[PDB]
Amino acid sequence: LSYNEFIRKVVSDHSIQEQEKEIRRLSQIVFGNQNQLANQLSQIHENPSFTKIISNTLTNSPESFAKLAGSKTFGIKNSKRKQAEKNISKLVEAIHKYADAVENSMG
């Protein structure tokens, strides 16, 4: 309702939106579905304290959520699979940034 408040909201809204976009881009690479983690994102949005649990699973057991993009044949990962794996770290970071932005907007 105040000018400074409106500015803070604009910036806050913006950082949320930019992370959502990057999460979609990275999810496409990791899982082949830019909305693969829609459930988890809305869960985090509702309660950002769930971010640690979800992030740990993504880091250590990503195929709990879905099969990774690409394939692995007799232990040999093709190029799509290698790119999927190499983007998990940045997907986790984007989810942490999203959670931080949501957590900050709440106050």
Exp. method: X-ray
In the 8-state DSSP scheme, what is residue 35?
T
Domain count of the chain? 1
Amino acid, res. 41 = L
Q: Which helix (H) or strand (E) holds 73?
A: strand 72-73
**Declared resolution, Å:** 2.0
Phi-psi region of 75 (alpha: psi -120 to 50; beta: other; left: phi over 0): left
18: Cα separation from own chain's centroid? 11
Q: Structural domain of residue 6, as residue ranges? A: 1-107
Residue with tokens 């770290």: 89
- List the structure tokens of 4: 């400074």
Residue 20 contacts by C-beta under 8 Å, 6 or more apart in sequence? 41, 98
CA–CA gap between residue 47 and residue 41 (Å, rounded):
10
Residue 77's DSSP bridge partners are: 72
C-alpha torsion 39→106→104→57, nearest 10: -20
